[PDB]
């Protein structure tokens, strides 16, 4: 089949681990629990997903998962303006490690709220990447986001 290397980037406390879990299972220590065999657009594929929970702080690990990673979910929480402000430096670091202006990624809002969807879409259009919003708890608009990134990789 085809194996896709997905990385979930974003600040802590946005629920990126909770969403990543909601995608797969219904034990993360083992290698199985961050791998999901699913069929997309006719053909089967393997999603090798990597959460960045504790790995953000270490610059070396940051570069390893950026160099190995094929697609990125730049996640933020709609009720946290600063979480939305960090995505810029996320994108710039990814650009330096990949040395390209066309990097496969998808901007994701998650979880009242202090960020309006218009702002996030303006940024996503500002650097030509799709934009989706999710609810990791109930609605789980998750498959749409991950599969959007998968299609972004396939069409690179």
């Amino acid at each position: 089949m085809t194996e896709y290397k997905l990385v979930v980037v974003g600040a802590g406390g946005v629920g990126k681990s909770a969403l990543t879990i909601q995608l797969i299972q219904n034990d993360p220590t083992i290698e199985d629990s961050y791998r999901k065999q699913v069929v997309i657009d006719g053909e089967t594929c393997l999603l090798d997903i990597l959460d960045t929970a504790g790995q953000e702080e270490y610059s070396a690990m940051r570069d390893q998962y950026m160099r190995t990673g094929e697609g990125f979910l730049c996640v933020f929480a709609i009720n946290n303006t600063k979480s939305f402000e960090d995505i810029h430096q996320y994108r710039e670091q990814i650009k330096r490690v990949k040395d390209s202006d066309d990097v496969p990624m998808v901007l994701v809002g998650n979880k009242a709220r202090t960020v309006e969807s218009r702002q996030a879409q303006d940024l996503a259009r500002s650097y030509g990447i799709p934009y989706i919003e999710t609810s990791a708890k109930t609605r789980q608009g998750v498959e749409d986001a991950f599969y959007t990134l998968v299609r972004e990789i396939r069409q690179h």
Binding site: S59, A60, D63
Partner: protein, 338 residues
């Protein structure tokens, strides 16, 4: 279940559950409410005996986690009310109150550099508090918790120091000699089973600002390139670091500087299963897995290194690490050299 879980017994001094409850309750149920539960359950057929059991549990848990009162005026208030209440009864002969309220830089060699770095990494690691890990899992940022901040800054400064140490040399051959030396250092760190500093040094080697220097990797020895490939394969992201985990399982004795991936795992186990069930009661197995995964780290904090080192030389190396370079200047220099 709160009344059902608190029912941990002490025969005037005597469990696993008890340890779990006292260490892990703060994750889900706030501690001030637990102390209020103890005070309220205090007042209860010939059961001054169990009132003494309660006093012994309070004394035990305050002595085991002496940190439950720095950040929590509410808990301090409720336990003060508790001891004042016991002192205000006067019976039970509980002296628990009166006993309670009281230019060249590295002429070193590979093994010595590895051992001094390991000694630093272990000393900074050992200062990490489990409540720092609690704050990391809950808050989402290390911030406001200095010990692990110093650990992560230590690793970041190791990587920065490796990069700037390679780039400080004119020519691809000089840099290639530096690369040979650091690959040997990484080999010795693998032999010593220090995987955290091994990650820092390897990523400093595998950093994008360094990996782009093709002439240097051309002069790099083929055996050195092979070892570097095997190490990057070891610390790689594939299968949530399955190769790293296979080794970590296959290590023994003093294998124990660990990686921040444990942090990751904690966060995973935090969001995988819910804190509390819809019944209103909370399910313990989550907290048990968390508690044993943390006690692993504490047990690692316990042991002693096999190798010794020169404290003043440690000071010199620490002073060598604290430079001030950003990814910006590092990339500018790497670009200036190719």
């Amino acid at each position: 279940l709160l009344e059902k879980c608190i029912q941990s017994f002490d025969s005037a001094g005597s469990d696993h559950m008890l340890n779990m409850v006292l260490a892990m309750h703060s994750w889900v149920l706030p501690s001030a409410d637990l102390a209020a539960r103890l005070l309220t359950s205090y007042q209860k057929d010939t059961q001054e005996l169990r009132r003494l059991q309660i006093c012994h549990l309070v004394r035990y848990w305050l002595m085991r986690h002496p940190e439950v009162m720095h950040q929590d005026p509410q808990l301090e208030e409720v336990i003060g009310r508790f001891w004042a209440t016991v002192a205000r009864e006067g019976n039970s002969a509980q002296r628990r109150l009166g006993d309670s309220s009281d230019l060249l830089f590295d002429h070193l060699e590979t093994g010595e550099l590895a051992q001094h770095l390991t000694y630093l990494e272990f000393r900074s690691f050992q200062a990490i508090t489990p409540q720092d890990l609690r704050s990391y899992v809950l808050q989402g940022s290390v911030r406001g918790c200095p010990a692990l901040e110093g650990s992560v800054g230590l690793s970041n400064s190791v990587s920065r120091w490796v990069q700037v140490m390679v780039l400080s040399r004119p020519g691809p051959l000089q840099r290639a000699q530096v690369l040979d030396k650091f690959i040997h250092v990484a080999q010795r760190l693998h032999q010593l089973q220090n995987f955290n500093t091994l990650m820092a040094v390897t990523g400093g080697l595998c950093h994008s600002a360094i990996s782009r220097l093709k002439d240097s990797h051309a002069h790099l020895s083929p055996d050195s390139t092979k070892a570097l490939l095997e190490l990057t394969e070891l610390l790689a992201s594939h299968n949530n670091y399955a190769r790293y985990r296979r080794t970590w399982a296959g290590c023994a004795g003093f294998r124990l500087p660990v990686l921040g991936v444990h942090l990751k795992d904690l966060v995973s186990l935090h969001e995988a299963q819910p804190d509390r069930l819809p019944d209103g009661r909370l399910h313990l197995p989550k907290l048990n897995n968390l508690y044993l995964r943390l006690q692993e780290l504490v047990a690692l904090q316990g042991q002693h290194p096999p190798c010794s080192a020169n404290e003043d030389l440690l000071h010199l190396l620490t002073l060598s690490l604290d430079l001030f370079y950003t990814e910006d200047e590092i990339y500018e220099l790497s670009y200036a050299r190719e």
